[PDB]
């Protein structure tokens, strides 16, 4: 039970490494959100020009 408590506390730290990795995924998805509004603005500037 001593080394079962230890392995579970190692699995806590490996689950706190997912709570850091999934925070980086959300920031990267916010970086495509800010670029998708640039793409629509840029294609409105290209559409009036090509016209």
């Amino acid at each position: 039970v001593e080394e079962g408590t230890k392995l579970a506390d190692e699995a806590d730290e490996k689950l706190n490494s997912i709570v850091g990795a999934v925070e980086r995924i959300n920031e990267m998805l916010q970086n495509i959100a800010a670029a998708i509004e640039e793409q629509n603005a840029a294609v409105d500037e290209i559409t009036t020009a090509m016209t």
């Binding site: 039970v1 079962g4 408590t5 579970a8 506390d9 699995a11 806590d12 689950l15 706190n16 997912i18 709570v19 999934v22 995924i25 959300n26 998805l29 495509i32 959100a33 998708i36 793409q39 629509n40 294609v43 290209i46 559409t47 090509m50």
Partner: protein
């Protein structure tokens, strides 16, 4: 005419990415919530184990 065709696939691609991004942002929220339950059940199983 070539530019007009390119600007069409740029518009279509942008909408496909806008939809895909929207969905992926939703899945990221669903993922952090299951890490809230998974960590709750593990900070309580370590407490039962140490008891």
């Amino acid at each position: 005419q070539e530019t007009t065709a390119g600007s069409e696939e740029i518009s279509s691609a942008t909408k496909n990415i806008a939809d895909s991004a929207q969905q992926a942002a939703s899945f990221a929220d669903q993922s952090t919530q299951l890490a809230k339950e998974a960590g709750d059940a593990l900070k309580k199983v370590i407490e039962v184990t140490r008891m």
